[PDB]
Amino acid sequence: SSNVVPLNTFNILNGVQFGTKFFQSIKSIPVGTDLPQTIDNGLSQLIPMRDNMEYKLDLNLQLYCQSKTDHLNLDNLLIDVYRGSKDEKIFHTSRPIVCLALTDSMSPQEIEQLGPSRLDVYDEEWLNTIRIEDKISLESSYETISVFLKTEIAQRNLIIHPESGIKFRM
Amino acid sequence: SSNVVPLNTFNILNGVQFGTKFFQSIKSIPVGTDLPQTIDNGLSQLIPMRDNMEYKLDLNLQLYCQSKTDHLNLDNLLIDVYRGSKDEKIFHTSRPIVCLALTDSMSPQEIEQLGPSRLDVYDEEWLNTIRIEDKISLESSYETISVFLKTEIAQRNLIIHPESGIKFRM
Amino acid sequence: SSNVVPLNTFNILNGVQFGTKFFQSIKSIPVGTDLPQTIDNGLSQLIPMRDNMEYKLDLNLQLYCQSKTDHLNLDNLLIDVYRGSKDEKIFHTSRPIVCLALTDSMSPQEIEQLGPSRLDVYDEEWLNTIRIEDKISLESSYETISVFLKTEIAQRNLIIHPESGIKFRM
Amino acid sequence: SSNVVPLNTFNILNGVQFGTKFFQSIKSIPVGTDLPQTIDNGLSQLIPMRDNMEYKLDLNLQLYCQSKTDHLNLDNLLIDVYRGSKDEKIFHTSRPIVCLALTDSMSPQEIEQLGPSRLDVYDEEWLNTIRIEDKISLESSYETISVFLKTEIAQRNLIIHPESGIKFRM
Amino acid sequence: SSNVVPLNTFNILNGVQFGTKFFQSIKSIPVGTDLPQTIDNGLSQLIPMRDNMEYKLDLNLQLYCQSKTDHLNLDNLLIDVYRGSKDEKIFHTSRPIVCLALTDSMSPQEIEQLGPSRLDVYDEEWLNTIRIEDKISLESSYETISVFLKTEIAQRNLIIHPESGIKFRM
Amino acid sequence: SSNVVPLNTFNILNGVQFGTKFFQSIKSIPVGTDLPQTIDNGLSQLIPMRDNMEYKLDLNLQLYCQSKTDHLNLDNLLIDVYRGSKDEKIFHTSRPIVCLALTDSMSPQEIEQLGPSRLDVYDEEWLNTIRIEDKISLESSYETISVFLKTEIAQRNLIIHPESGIKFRM
Amino acid sequence: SSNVVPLNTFNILNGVQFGTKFFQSIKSIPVGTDLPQTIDNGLSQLIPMRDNMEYKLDLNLQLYCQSKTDHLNLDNLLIDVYRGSKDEKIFHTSRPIVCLALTDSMSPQEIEQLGPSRLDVYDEEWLNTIRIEDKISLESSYETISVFLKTEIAQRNLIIHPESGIKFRM
Amino acid sequence: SSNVVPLNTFNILNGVQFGTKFFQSIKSIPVGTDLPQTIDNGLSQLIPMRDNMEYKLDLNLQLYCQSKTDHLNLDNLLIDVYRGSKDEKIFHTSRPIVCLALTDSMSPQEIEQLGPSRLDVYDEEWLNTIRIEDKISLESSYETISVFLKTEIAQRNLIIHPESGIKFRM
Amino acid sequence: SSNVVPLNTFNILNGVQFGTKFFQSIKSIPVGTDLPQTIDNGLSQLIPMRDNMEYKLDLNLQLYCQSKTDHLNLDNLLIDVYRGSKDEKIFHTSRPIVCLALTDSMSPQEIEQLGPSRLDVYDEEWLNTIRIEDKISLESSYETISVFLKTEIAQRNLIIHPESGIKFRM
Amino acid sequence: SSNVVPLNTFNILNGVQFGTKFFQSIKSIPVGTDLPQTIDNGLSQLIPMRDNMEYKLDLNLQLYCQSKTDHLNLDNLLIDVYRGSKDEKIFHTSRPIVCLALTDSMSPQEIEQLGPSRLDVYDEEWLNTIRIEDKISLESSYETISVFLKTEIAQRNLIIHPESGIKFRM
């Protein structure tokens, strides 16, 4: 029922005026066809959707923001969800995020408390968890879904966690 | 009754002599029409207002101030509310705010106390909560509402929290 | 009775030889007219005053001093109250104030004690509270009141708190 | 009886070879005239003195010394009291004072102990309290009183506290 | 049954547009032939696989990331598994990793806690453990298996732990 | 009996080869004339001395030494007492003194212990107390007394405490 | 039986493209000849081996890695064992090692705990213990054994412990 | 009996090849003449000595050594005692001394323990106490006594304590 | 029996390609001649050896390694023992040693624990004790013994302890 | 019996190729002549020695080593004792010593523990105590004794303690 589609199974088109674009097509199988699930293999996969039924989208997005040159330590992530005339926007939000700068270093105290592994320290300290739930609605009649992630203040390096994805709930 | 209109559903017009402008039109539906609410999708939406009745506005504004070049660590935010001759000002106030500078960094002690996540540290330390309540009154006869946020001392980067908005109380 | 007139309802005329000037006119309504109060909306408003009666002024002035270029950490604020020939001075005083410099930064210890919010630290540490009470007397016959705030040693940035104002007591 | 005359009611004439000069005239009202007091409004006021009677002067002088360019952290204040041929000196003294330098900054420990407000820290740490009592005698026959405050080692910024003044005792 | 094939028994082809490539051929012995194991000697060895049976691959990958010139302290490792027209991708994933920079040094406290040996400190602090399990499926009909490890943000030095390898489960 | 003559009632003649010179004349009133005392007003006053009787001088000298340019932190003060041919020396001594340098600053710990006021810290830490007692003898027949204070190693700023003076004992 | 051959009894040929080479010839004495042992004198000695019997090699390698110029604090040691056409490789492995940099210094705490002698601190902290056991097999028919130790990332100084050697087990 | 002759009552002749010279003549009064004492006034005084009797000299020498330019923190003081052909040396010794350098400053801890007064800290920390006792013998037949104090390594500033002198014991 | 020959009784020939050379001749006295001992006076002495008997050498070598310019904090000492065609090597070994660098300084804690004397701290912390025992054998037929001490990585200053020497056991 | 001859009673001849030379002649008084002692006055004195009897010399040598320019913190002192053809060496030894450098400064902790006086800190921390006992033998037939102290690594400043000397035991 709750088909989770990871973002690595989307088509990625990086740009400079719109940030990162996650677009993917939609396949509409008819009723009584045993809805399949999206294989979590990081391969471009068409999203299975019931033929005529409204689907509600839950966006789970974990990412690491890292500064390129400007080294500003706070930024605003812009999320824009589109759908298949031209594409019409159905959702837009902004989320303040923390971005790694070259002047940031772990204190020895942070190693002792947050975990000896330094990946754990970034997971508990710098990971940006963004969850848009019960806000996006999409129907299978539309044949395209697009997600835009753009940094507002400065152009930066975004490291999207592999488990980030959109949950297509019943 | 208490229709909350988030600021991301307003039309944004950034400038250099007036700061950021949040203008939006007003729709006047007649009585007995089941007042709708503003969908929190970040899309430009006309504000629903009762046909002939005085509305009181409560401005909730959470934002992150961040210095561009001047790096001054304190600023004065200027809030100016207009309405639809030319637009007439109905409210004006100033609020001192704290702005992130490139010379500011978290101490290890702040990580331990305010929260391991560094977004929590900014939320509890640098977030500017500004609440103008029971001070602004607007009637549905006027067909425009405008909010101006301008920094006085220096031109800066303002990161408005997504939950910031104006509450149109009964 | 105790009509509080905030300074943002005054007319502001910034200069370079006299500092900031807060001038505003006076309206003299006759007796038995239900003395109104000044609306705290930050809009230029004539001060209501009883037709023939001596009023005593209490100046409440909270402000943030911040250094522009000189970066001197102490200054002398000069307060001069005038009234409506030319304007005649009726009160003058000086108050030492603390001014933010670019070499000043919060210690981690100050965050823990004075409050996690950094605006609280400035409120409890750098805010200059100046209260002139029972020293200024003005009658409604005069049709102008002017307040001058000037820094003596150096030209600086003054951030006047929005609640600063003059209380016109019975 | 103990008429306190604040120094801001004197005439101030700043110079470069003599420092700051506080000169003011004297009015001699006759006996049985209900000796008035000096209004603490910071306005130039003639000092009321009994017609024929010796008055003893108590000089209360609180000030903030602040270095201009030399940044020396200790200085010698020279106090010279004159009276109304030319003016004849009747008192002279020197008082070592502490002067703020641009290399001085508060430790976090001083904030916790001496008071969260940084004006309190300067009041308890850098304020120079100078009290000359029972040393100066002046009669109302002389029609002028002059006080000179000059820094000896270097030319500096003196911030005289508003409550500083001369007490004309019975 | 669970034949573990270390990555040092693969053929290594370092590049600049695709990172490090681990390609190796597959030998298909028939049934009833006493499946041999891969000798852990770091020598190029053909992978033994049952003639007609689906094998599931478990990728165990421990590595040390170290910055060359860019000195960025966080990176995204890209894993792409291919198989033997041209090679078709069957799996792709990204894993955030921590990379040693020349500005990083051990604190004395880390020596006391994580172990006196400094290799233990890197093992418990900087070693990137990446385990893809129950996600990759490969059949012996295909005669080639390829693994690509590429750093996304910057070109870096990857030190693959000798025990890293792919487990060919029953 | 013990007439204390403060040094500010002497005539001061600063030089460069002899340091600071404190010279003053002597008045010899006859017996049975009610020996007066020296008024502590900082005005040049002739020293009252009994007509024919040996007087013993006690030199009390408190001063603040402060470095001009050389910034050496220790110096040798040279005291030479003369009397009224040419003047004949009757006493000479040297006293090591501590001199303020521009590289000296108070620690926060010194504020807590020696006193919150920073003038108290200099009084208890840098004030040079020099007391020559029962060593100098002068008779009223001689009509001049001269005291020379000169720094030996370097030319410096001496801040003589106002209470410093010579006690003319019975 | 377990003849231990220290590496200092090998022939050393340092290079730049292959690192350090430890090559030595093999003498094949016949059966019933009282197998001698290798004298631990650091002199080039032929390895005694039984005439026709498979020998298993256990490599014990303790070394100190020290950075020359690059100062990177982690490296990958490459071990390649050859034997006597051209030489054929029979074993290859990689071992991450810790390398001394010029920015590394002992904390006083490490002296107290790991031992007062500073050679003990390096022995317990920086010594790289590498033991390849039960992985290398060599027969006496081959007349040459070669061991290559090469640093992968950077060219460094390797200080091989004198007790390092290869154990030729029964 | 134990006539103490302070060094300031000697004739001082500073040089560059021999350091500081303390020479003074000797007066030989006959027996039964009530041996006088040397007045401690810092004036050149002939040393009283019994006509025909061997005197033993005890040299008490307290001094402050301070570096001029070389800033070396240790020196060797050379003491040479002569007497009245040419002068013949009767005693010579060397004493290591500590010399103030411009890189030396008091720690806050030294203020708390050794005394709040900074002259006490130098008295207990940098004062060089040199006492040659029961080593020098001089007879009144010789009419001259000379003491040479010279620094060996470098030319420095010596601040001889006023109580330093030679004790002429019975 | 156990004749200890200190290394200072050897002939020292410092070089640049071989390090320090300790060569000395051998005298062969016949049996029944009361074997003398080597006088520990630091003078070149022929080593007494029994005419025809194998002697076993025990090398005791304590030294201080100190960096000249390279300042590397770890080195490898190379010991080569020769004997009297050309000289034939009979022993060779390498010993890792710790070398003083100009960036190394004692902590105050090391003074308290390892001993107040700073020579004790070097004795317990930086002294390299090297003891080769029961490994070197030399017969009196050979008329020369040579010991070479050379630093491998860098040319350094070796301070050989005076008690270092070779023990010629029975 | 145990005549102690301080080194300051020797003739000193400083050089550059041999260091400091302490040479002095020997006087041979016959038996039954009441052996005198060497007066500790720092004057060149012939050493008294019994006419025909072997004397054993005990060298007591305390000195302060201080770096001139090289600033190396460890050195090797070379002691060579000669006697009166040319002079023949009878003893030679080397002693590692600690030398003051311009980068060395006392910690506040060392003042508290080793003694408030800073000369005590050097006495307990930097003083080099060298005692050669029961190693040197000299007979009165030889008419000259010479002691050479030379620093090996670098030319330095040696401050020999005044109590250093040679004890001529019975």
Residue numbers in the entry:
A (entry chain H), B (entry chain G), C (entry chain F), D (entry chain E), E (entry chain I), F (entry chain D), ...: 49 to 132, 145 to 230
The authors write:
Lipid droplets (LDs) are universal lipid storage organelles with a core of neutral lipids, such as triacylglycerols, surrounded by a phospholipid monolayer. This unique architecture is generated during LD biogenesis at endoplasmic reticulum (ER) sites marked by Seipin, a conserved membrane protein mutated in lipodystrophy. We show that Sei1 forms a homodecameric ring that scaffolds and positions Ldb16, with the latter emerging as the primary TAG binder via specific hydroxyl-containing residues, as proposed for human Seipin.
Similarly, cells expressing Sei1∆LH, where a flexible linker replaced the LH, also failed to stabilize Ldb16. Moreover, Sei1∆LH and Sei1LL cells displayed aberrant LDs however, in comparison to sei1∆ mutant, the frequency of supersized LDs was reduced. Atomistic simulations reveal that in WT Sei1, TM1 and TM2 adopt a stable conformation and maintain a constant angle indicating that they move largely as a single unit. This coupling of Sei1 TM movement is impaired upon disruption of the methionine-aromatic interactions, in Sei1∆LH and Sei1LL. Besides their uncoordinated movement, TM segments in Sei1∆LH and Sei1LL appear to explore a higher membrane area. To further demonstrate that the effect of methionine-aromatic interactions was restricted to the positioning and dynamics of the TM segments we solved the structure of Sei1∆LH. FLAG-tagged Sei1∆LH was expressed and purified as above, and analyzed by cryo-EM. Like WT Sei1, expression of Sei1∆LH triggered dramatic changes in LD morphology in sei1∆ldb16∆ cells.
